[PDB]
Amino acid sequence: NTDDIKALRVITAIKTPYLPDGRFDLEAYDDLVNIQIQNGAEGVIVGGTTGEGQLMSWDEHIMLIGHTVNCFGGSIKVIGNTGSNSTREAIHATEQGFAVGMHAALHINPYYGKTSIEGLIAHFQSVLHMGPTIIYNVPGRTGQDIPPRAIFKLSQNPNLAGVKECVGNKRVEEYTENGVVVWSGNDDECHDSRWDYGATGVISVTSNLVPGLMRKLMFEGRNSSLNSKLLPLMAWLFHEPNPIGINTALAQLGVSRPVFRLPYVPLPLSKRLEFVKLVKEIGREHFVGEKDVQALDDDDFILIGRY
Amino acid sequence: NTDDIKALRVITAIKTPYLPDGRFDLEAYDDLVNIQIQNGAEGVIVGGTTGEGQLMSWDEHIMLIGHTVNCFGGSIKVIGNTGSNSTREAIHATEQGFAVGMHAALHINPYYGKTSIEGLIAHFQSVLHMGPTIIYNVPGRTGQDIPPRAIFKLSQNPNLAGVKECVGNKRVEEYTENGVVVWSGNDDECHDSRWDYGATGVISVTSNLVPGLMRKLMFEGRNSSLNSKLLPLMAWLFHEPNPIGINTALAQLGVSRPVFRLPYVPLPLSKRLEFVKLVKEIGREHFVGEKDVQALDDDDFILIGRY
Amino acid sequence: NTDDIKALRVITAIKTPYLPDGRFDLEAYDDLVNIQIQNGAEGVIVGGTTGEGQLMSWDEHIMLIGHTVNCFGGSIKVIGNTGSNSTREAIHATEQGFAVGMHAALHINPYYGKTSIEGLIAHFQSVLHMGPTIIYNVPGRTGQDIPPRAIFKLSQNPNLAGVKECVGNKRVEEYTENGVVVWSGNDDECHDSRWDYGATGVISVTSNLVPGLMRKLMFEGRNSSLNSKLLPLMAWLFHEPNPIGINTALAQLGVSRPVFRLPYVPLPLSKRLEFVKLVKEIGREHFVGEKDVQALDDDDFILIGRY
Amino acid sequence: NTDDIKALRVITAIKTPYLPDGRFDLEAYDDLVNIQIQNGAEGVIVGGTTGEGQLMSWDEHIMLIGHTVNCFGGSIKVIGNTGSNSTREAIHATEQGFAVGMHAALHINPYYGKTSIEGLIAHFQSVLHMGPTIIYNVPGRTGQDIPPRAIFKLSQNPNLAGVKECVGNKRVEEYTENGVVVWSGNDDECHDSRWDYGATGVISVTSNLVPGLMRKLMFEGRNSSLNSKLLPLMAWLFHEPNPIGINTALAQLGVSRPVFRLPYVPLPLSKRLEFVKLVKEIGREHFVGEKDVQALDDDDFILIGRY
Ligand SMILES: N[C@@H](CCCC[NH3+])C(=O)O
Ligand SMILES: N[C@@H](CCCC[NH3+])C(=O)O
Ligand SMILES: N[C@@H](CCCC[NH3+])C(=O)O
Ligand SMILES: N[C@@H](CCCC[NH3+])C(=O)O
Ligand code: NA
Ligand code: NA
Ligand code: NA
Ligand code: NA
Ligand code: NA
Ligand code: NA
Ligand code: NA
Ligand code: NA
Ligand code: NA
Ligand code: NA
């Protein structure tokens, strides 16, 4: 049902944690999803950008979606990231994700092998009939800005739930004034996006760390002092490209093992020490996990290319 | 041997033609490669952006490399596009591409899931030991400009042959002043890149149509009137994102079937009528194949999602 | 939980039905599983021999397991056939099947590339720790009889639920006298296996057609007149190798489309006419579906090699 | 060309050696192939039963074929084992194997999911049009004896080169009396098959160890004393199912690493000490490689499941 996707305000693009040889750590993963549920997260993107969907083989990506649905699907909406720059891969991944019971699909436009606007419509029309879909526009990553006129055309399909928008609040505004549901994809804009530009909520990286605070920010009104308390954390999280920050942070909080699939590599020690300061400034009680935050040594990290 | 790669001036990023069910049309592909050889192309990229490597599965990609090596490897350099945004997939694809006998690899930086400069170094160092490599910088497609300082760090690796650069002639000049071999990735700049800015040559889209003229442009001295006669054809080929133009043109020339793997769709008839006029203005004798060029109807083109 | 697998008496190796181009027909499949549930089937093997697991790619096999768990897993035990002649494929398929929530795994011994008894133990020990497992011995198909001493050793693992045994009642007896749970894999022996040789029940092909009668046979005592009423049907079902009969029968009853993935091909018209007679002799009210049984013409069947 | 296949008398089903992580050891593989060439082997089967095609993924299988073609295809016939119990996989694998340049295909009848004789015809006819083919009958592994009448139906297809027959010399004689080319698949029968029953030659396991002697056995006339000197080595190689023996022997000769992909495990030390004694009795100068033969300890062998 599309309405139940359009109602969600806090959707976590959840991190995918790894065992020391690079396989998925399902125990760590299930603990992360439980913590999100317990703090009032309402949806999860499985294998999004933050979840390193880009480094999974399809078999592990589908498995992670079916696993999430099977263990948690009665307590949180499960949105599979089954988009691709290849229409073939997007069709197969999407019908398989819905077949295993996911509630919605996140679809990016084709990245790297960008196409024409007419190719864009054709790509999205190949999958939009399969179930509730969120379209993801992030031109800083894909190389291509999905134009509003393509979204207005696609939003004729009742399966289109809305758009995860990264271009900025002026774009959010153009959609929401025209009746298209939008989730901000920029944590550091999502407060204003919510309260001033009609965004329904956020598809967040930062809620991997402080889900209770992100939920407060999306449900309890303007609170620019809470927003600006979170801004240093968000800036830290994006000092290098996502998910490098979140991968480093979750290892420091002891909820994830310090294992990276290449090409990502941890933030250096000076940044890690900054994170230890942010956690003390904001308060450890707001962060996921129970263990004391650690700086970690460089020697603690495992980088794997053959996963 | 890296020196043999360094010496190529004309490398064609060859188009991959399809059968109406979406599979590779190997007979048409062989004809295209033969045609390149008879016109003096010195290298092909197999499954590059132009060859839609992005739409292939790894098994069909490695197969096309091994097929290209087995049929043509004594007459042209075969450069497999075995890069990936995933280090795991880049390591596997590169190992297998070298095992079936390709002479070099083309490696892009990770697109879409972009990484830090440190991660980029880890990524390239995971494959550079395998054999002669060209690094590919096209930030308009990947979302990330590879900084010269990263290349300079890698360039003393004896396997780094040089860089396929799309940023422009000022970046070309910075690399060649610093002693890095550069191929221009922009057909509409490669003349000047070659004669004014020290590029060794071009990795070309336009040579799929006019290989003899592109060879002339890279070997015979500055020729600004040849260059400006090709410029309108070059603009036509990039009207929509490559390979939309080349896929359309080759179908009109009758050397490939009018079959598109999604998300690409053809140029519309008004552009296809311009292409007919360009062939006549430049001379059909310079274009690949021998069939009379056709305009084609929109209903000639088969758009396939489930390949 | 292993006990809940050991309790099941009627497990249907369910047929996998296809669309006209060879993809899975999930609508037809869901109707078959619903009919099994409604007639008191207690488990299903997903992608067994009968379900043509051997012709699926892994992605579709895992998908079918996760689909079955998600739609039906609260009303019937879902047993994935995640065995393989390759230990690698068996490990991956099995952990993925359990991750998507299947209740048990069916594991055959390595077929075609048969191994030593010591290789057999090693193969099974690679997967037995993952969850409740039924080991499948069918030497007429694999080329190798799993010996009782390998099963006695493996049955030290609390995850071993029991054995699907095809060698015959004397083998069933040897296991059941020693405390190992057995399901007969031979429909035409399963009555005697149940009542005289201690089998817990049957993993049945014939219950795809007459699930209510197979359930009666397994729960309601010796009834050799019911058994011998079913024998002509069972003999028909195995006139050619399974699943050729069941695929032809379900198409005749109108619950499946008449589409075969090669190398299977339908029974000829004279056999189909015999099936029409068996259905009238036993009574259409005992067979799955509501449509009148049809002979079908040869022209109605679709055989597909490129699925 | 089919006539060139028909003329080969000594074809080695080459072993695939592994690195300790489970990947192919291509350097050792090249040495083994070179050694076959220097001793007069005329064809190799790549990824046959002996080469563990059954444990490979299709991409590594097609890669090994293309690698074998690219490095050795001018000096030996390369016959890809591209058969499968799945017609879909046999069609794809065969197309790709021919595309990377193999000279012929080896096709087994569908094993485990066995089909009717009509289905078997449909299966073989789906791949026979692709190029020169040897059909492989080994009912002790597949569960199904291909009947001569099926081969006779297919043998007027100009692509059928002939049959690799494991049933025995009486079946060999029936085929050769009927004008079908036959290679013996049983090392311990191939002498008599060759000199008494009209076989053209052998597709051999034992030539992985003693290629020069096996060539002698097939080319130089009846030699019953050479034959009976090889018989004890041949018995040793089939003590457990092939390729357990050959994998053990090559490791002891030091031409491959002591690495096994599961489900195969090595022969125990008492057999490995017999192999040392056989090398000495026959003469090390006849065996592949030049390292002194070693017994090896059980703890030398790496058994890998997650390759
Ligand atoms: N690396 C590829 C494959 C990912 C497949 C699983 N999501 C991509 O980013 O498109
Ligand atoms: N569509 C994926 C996979 C391509 C794999 C073959 N080159 C990508 O662009 O990364
Ligand atoms: N045809 C192969 C692959 C099947 C994979 C899905 N069960 C086999 O029978 O082993
Ligand atoms: N294990 C499967 C797949 C092998 C695929 C590569 N030859 C089989 O024996 O059919
Ligand atoms: Na608002
Ligand atoms: Na807390
Ligand atoms: Na906490
Ligand atoms: Na010409
Ligand atoms: Na021409
Ligand atoms: Na009993
Ligand atoms: Na009924
Ligand atoms: Na019924
Ligand atoms: Na020697
Ligand atoms: Na030797």
Residue numbers in the entry:
A (entry chain A), B (entry chain B), C (entry chain A), D (entry chain B): 59 to 365
Task: Provide the authors' original text about this structure.
In plants, DHDPS is inhibited by lysine, and thus is a key enzyme in regulating lysine biosynthesis. The structure of the tobacco enzyme shows that plant DHDPS is a homotetramer, made up of a dimer of tight dimers.
To investigate the effect of (S)-lysine binding to the structure of At-DHDPS2, we performed crystal soaks with lysine, and compared the structures of the lysine bound and unbound forms. Electron density showed that (S)-lysine is bound in the same allosteric pocket previously observed for Ns-DHDPS and Ec-DHDPS. The carboxyl group of (S)-lysine is coordinated by Tyr130 and Asn143, while the α-amino group contacts the main chain oxygen of Gln112, and Glu147 and Asn143 of the opposing subunit. An overlay of the (S)-lysine bound and unbound structures showed a surprisingly low difference between the structures, with Cα RMSDs of only 0.29 Å and 0.30 for the superposition of the tight-dimers (i.e. the crystallographic asymmetrical unit) and the authentic tetramers, respectively. Indeed, the changes observed in the lysine bound crystal structure compared to the unliganded structure are confined to residues of the lysine binding pocket itself. The side chain of Trp116 undergoes a shift in rotamer upon lysine binding, closing down against the side chain of the bound lysine in a gate like action.
